[PDB]
Nucleic acid binder design. Structure first.
Ligand code: ZN
Lengths: 50, 248, 93, 106, 69, 93
RNA sequence: CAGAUCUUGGUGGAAGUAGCAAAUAUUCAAAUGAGAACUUUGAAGACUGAAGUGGGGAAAGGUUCCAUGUGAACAGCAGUUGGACAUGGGUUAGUCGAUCCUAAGAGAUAGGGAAGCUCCGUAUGAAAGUUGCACGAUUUUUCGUGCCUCCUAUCGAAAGGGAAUCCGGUUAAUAUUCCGGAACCAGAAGGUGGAAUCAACACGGCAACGUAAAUGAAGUUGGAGACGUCGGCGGGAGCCCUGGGAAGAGUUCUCUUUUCUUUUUAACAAACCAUUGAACUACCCUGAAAUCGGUUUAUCCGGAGCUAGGGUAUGGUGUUUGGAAGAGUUCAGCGCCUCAUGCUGAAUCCGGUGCGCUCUCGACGGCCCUUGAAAAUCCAACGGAAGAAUGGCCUUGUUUUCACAUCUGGUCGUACUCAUAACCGCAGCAGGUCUCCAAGGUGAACAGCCUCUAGUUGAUAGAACAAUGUAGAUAAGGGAAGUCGGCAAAAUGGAUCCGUAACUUCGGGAUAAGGAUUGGCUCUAAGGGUUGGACAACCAACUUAGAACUGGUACGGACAAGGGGAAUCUGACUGUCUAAUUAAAACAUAGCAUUGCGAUGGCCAGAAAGUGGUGUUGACGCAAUGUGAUU
């Protein structure tokens, strides 16, 4: 609400960083089948729950 | 069944509302000055205590042992005016507003804020318009018989203190409340006991009087004295019941 | 104009609460909202505040009196004052 | 006409959210948050406000000079002139009464 | 901002060490404002006479930095 | 339209939606009338046309709604002054 | 395995079917593009109509904010577009909050219970200790002791209390934070300087009291913080309205010296402050008042000292200035690839008004068996601890509660939505979610209706009006004959003037019932404010009443907006409940009555407790019941 604690802001920063597209080279690694990921979170679909 | 409202009144929600109250109305600590002579204080404030029908008197006293002024919270007697002098002790004059030992007062005197025991700092006759009458004295094993507002006779040690006069506030119960709002405002600053729902208007799970196709108690409302909580409702240990026309 | 045959101050209550209750309240409020004389200043300026406190204004005698619910002095208190005065005189003499 | 908004994140009309309309040198009508009004010190014996002392918040009195917070008199800035005079007369008369009481005792 | 009306007081406050810069402002009503930038306050003197303004400028400390806006 | 209303147009019974009190309070009208009457009474008293006693009587009468307007008050003052002068000249002999 | 309304998964007929219809509404042209009903631009027509579809916030969300690209999936139609996808960027504080304090409360510690998880308990039955002086010390200074005295854990509010910032400009996205200018607060140390001292720590006023300073340790006291609600009155700021001048724009068959936009002065600082607007508001001096006087819209004041005269204080959202025109705004020219966007010109002026709106202040009045927080912190007083110049002249102690000057002010939040798409409801759901500002006209009005600023034109579209529907209307004659039942609809409705019954608790009923009028135009009369030699030249105001004339015999012309009356049953009334079938005669209520209890107590609680509530209480009280106004 624009009035957030330091812990809340750090958690939001962590959530934002864990939302980026996956680089393709890691998926192309031999023996690595990361490929597509359903871990992607949208602000309007799945809430963080603090 | 279910726990009744009487059992639920053990605290919590049903605690007294004491935010706006100005302090306890204890007389004073029985010290050497009050035990051997008197001490003169000056009343400086007369204030209204919410939840109490009688005004309270803020009275300033000089500390005998320290350079300091002590303020008390006397229960104001009728005729008390700010700036007057009150005297507390054995040798105090028999004047309205003065605090004297009960045993040092003449028989038949009218007092207020009387102590049940020495040093109790006021127990009897504290409500507005109420007072205690000194019935008699008994020097041998010094005890004073007094008459309480309820009409009972109580024996107290002949060293308990009392305030000469009648508690201020007059007869407050002589005016009809006339409105549920007036009753609501009266009890709001006292506690959560209003309004009250009748037991016969309840269900059997709620009250012993609840249930039935008609609103009726079903059994006698006079219950024995040694009733368990939850069934001690109605008229507890009623010696008599009904309208009485003439008795002592 | 008279504006009221008998209700007087209780005209604010309309027709509710009953005639006897309105009459009793009318007497009480007439006593309650009355200017009284300061026993130390001699001016008819004593007014009630919060059911037992009576104060009079002016440059002097700003005393606050502990009185009755709606009268400065009650009959019972006056009788008690006379009784205490009598007892004090007997003890002194 | 121009309509204004609160300049702070307090969105309620509380006693600490007093605002005044100002016209800036840009033809802009906007709010200006202001503090509560000060209070003149009151007499300790009668409760009347004390003459010659400004009305300020409690912390604002620390920045004033000494003579602006008092009156050049005994009990100045704590009691009114009438209260001081009454105390002086009452003190002198009662001390005289004590002296005559002792002399009459002797 | 503070306003001065005494020529000698303005000269003294100009000769004071904290006085750093002076500004000359000419208005359409034939008035000249001398504004001294001190550490805490900006001091303004208003002069209505150009004859007096010229002598004030001459008597001002030449070591002081004075600019015209 | 405002000019026409100032001249006295569009002010009929069919153009009024609020009550007379709502359109113009009688309390405000009485306040203005009392202030006008008291101002005139003070002006006359400080000018010397009337004395303190006549001023006090007229002040109480104005508070009692004796005079409908300034003209009525002036006529009442003129009659009172004429009678007072008549008594003063009669008592000379 | 064929079943178990079997389990998991996949897939059918229904079926290209139901449907994608609330919230007035879109149209033309151009650009882009392969593709345009949905993108952008322009024009037109509209809506929200200031209690908004506007501008901001609290909670909640967390990057949705901005720029550049994309149109695989979502945007139940589409898409060149998006709160979608991808890549980067974006939140700058001594002054805004948190942080500090305390409220309801939470909760350690001592101690006591409990097998124990843990419970009670917060100066409690605790050896519960931080503040104040110099005893010693080279010498002009916080450490070792000397006897102290009711100190005390902490957490708990982004709406309570509180030290301090404004203006203009700037970005694609940040502004009381950045830039420019101009200020303020707190803390730390300590260069002047006048005052006074050849001896003590200033003067003035008959007073209220005033000043550029004008020594002050403990201890104590007082004040501020610090407080309800309603009603009227007066003042100020902003807005609204209005008369001129100036600049620009609109209309111009005709008329309109016309219509529309701008004409601005922040924090802070100084001097006045009843003048120019507003107390006799408080207090003081002279004087002593009945033939009592003064005085408010409102009835209060005076031998406890009126009226009157003269003073003192309270002092800004008031006045004159600085800030500050150098800013901003409007208009008009020159460079013309113009570059760091440069340069040259003007105006920004003089007046008025108010039962007007919002906010605020001042003096008042009413109400309470309701009297409407605490603490941190700051100030003042009583009191006198302590101090050392003297060769009549250099030299030091106070004055840094005078003025000026130096340094420092850490950490966390700051983007954006705040909702018919950024929160919750499975969703871009007609639901729900606290609050700030509120223009003009009509009108009593924050009603309804139209309009200005601002915003939007977003709710899949096209064609045609079949039955039956949903919503809105009308209808000759009859007028409830319909139906269980006047269900529904109609009818009445604003304002002014007449008139108003039974009954009644005398207060009501009552807007009872029942009648008349209402437009426009031209006038008349009355009700108020400074004013030149009892007169009186204008300016600036809204009402009320009446008359004539006139038209569709019409006029609260849209909107807005009581149907009324006669009886019975029941509940006295206001109020409350079965969220999502029952709002009632049910519950509650004041009133009335009964019962218990004087503290070693009544009632309630707890496993126990050196345990809790009533109880900051004391029979005019607490607790437990029944009935339900008044008579
Ligand atoms: Zn008195």
């Amino acid at each position: 609400p624009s009035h957030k604690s330091f812990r809340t802001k750090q958690k939001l920063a962590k959530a934002a960083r864990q939302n980026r597209p996956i680089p393709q080279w890691i998926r192309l690694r031999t023996g690595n089948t990361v490929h597509y990921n359903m871990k992607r979170r949208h602000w309007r679909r799945t809430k963080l729950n603090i | 069944g279910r726990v009744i409202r009487a059992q639920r009144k053990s605290g919590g929600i049903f605690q007294a509302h004491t935010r706006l109250r100005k302090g306890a109305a204890q007389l004073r600590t029985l010290d050497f000055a009050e035990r051997h002579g008197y001490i003169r204080g000056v009343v400086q404030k007369i204030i209204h205590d919410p939840g109490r029908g009688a005004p309270l008197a803020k009275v300033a006293f000089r500390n005998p042992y320290h350079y300091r002024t002590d303020v008390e919270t006397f229960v104001a007697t009728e005729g008390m005016y700010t700036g007057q002098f009150v005297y507390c002790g054995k040798n105090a004059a028999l004047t309205v507003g003065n605090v004297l030992p009960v045993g040092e007062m003449p028989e038949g005197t009218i007092i207020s804020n009387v102590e049940e025991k020495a040093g109790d700092r006021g127990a009897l006759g504290r409500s507005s318009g109420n007072y205690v009458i000194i019935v008699g004295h008994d020097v041998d094993t010094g005890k004073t018989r007094v008459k309480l507002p309820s009409g009972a006779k109580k024996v107290v040690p002949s060293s308990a203190r009392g305030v000469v006069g009648i508690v201020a506030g007059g007869g407050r119960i002589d005016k009809p409340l006339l409105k549920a709002g007036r009753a609501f405002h009266k009890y709001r600053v006292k506690r959560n006991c209003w309004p009250r729902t009748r037991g016969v208007a309840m269900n059997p799970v709620d009250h012993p009087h609840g249930g039935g196709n008609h609103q009726h108690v079903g059994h006698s409302t006079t219950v024995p004295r040694q009733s368990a909580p939850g069934q001690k409702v109605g008229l507890i240990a009623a010696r008599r019941t009904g309208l009485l026309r003439g008795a002592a | 104009t008279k504006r009221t045959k008998k209700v007087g101050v209780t005209g604010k209550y309309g027709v509710r609460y009953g005639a006897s209750l309105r009459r009793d309240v009318r007497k009480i409020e007439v006593q309650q909202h009355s200017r009284y004389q300061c026993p130390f200043c001699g001016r008819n300026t004593v007014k009630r505040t919060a059911a037992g406190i009576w104060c009079c204004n002016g440059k002097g005698c700003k005393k606050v009196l502990a009185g009755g619910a709606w009268t400065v002095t009650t009959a019972a208190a006056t009788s008690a004052r006379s009784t205490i005065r009598r007892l004090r005189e007997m003890v002194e003499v | 006409a121009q309509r204004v908004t609160y300049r702070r994140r307090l969105a309620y009309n509380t006693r600490s959210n007093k605002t005044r309309i100002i016209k800036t040198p840009g033809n802009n009508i906007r709010y200006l948050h202001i503090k509560k009004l000060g209070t003149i010190p009151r007499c300790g014996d009668t409760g009347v406000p004390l003459q010659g002392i400004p009305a300020l918040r409690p912390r604002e009195f620390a920045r004033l000079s000494h003579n602006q917070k008092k009156v050049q008199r005994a009990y100045g800035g704590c009691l009114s002139a009438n209260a001081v005079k009454d105390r002086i007369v009452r003190a002198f008369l009662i001390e005289e009464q004590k002296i005559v009481k002792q002399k009459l005792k002797q | 901002p503070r306003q001065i009306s005494d020529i000698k007081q303005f000269l003294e406050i100009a000769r004071r060490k904290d006085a750093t810069s002076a500004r000359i402002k000419k208005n359409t009503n034939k008035d000249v404002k001398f504004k001294l930038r001190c550490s805490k306050y900006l001091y303004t003197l208003v002069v209505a006479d150009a004859k007096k303004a010229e002598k004030l400028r001459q008597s001002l400390p030449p070591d002081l930095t004075v600019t015209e806006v | 339209t405002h000019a026409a209303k100032r001249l006295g147009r569009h002010t009929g019974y069919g153009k009024r939606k609020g009550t007379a009190e709502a359109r113009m309070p009688s309390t405000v009208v009485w306040m203005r009338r009392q202030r006008v009457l008291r101002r005139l009474l003070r002006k006359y008293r400080e000018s010397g046309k009337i004395d303190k006693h006549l001023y006090h009587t007229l002040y109480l009468e104005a508070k009692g709604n004796t005079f409908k307007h300034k003209r009525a008050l002036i006529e009442h003052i003129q009659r009172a002054k004429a009678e007072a002068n008549r008594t003063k000249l009669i008592q000379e002999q």
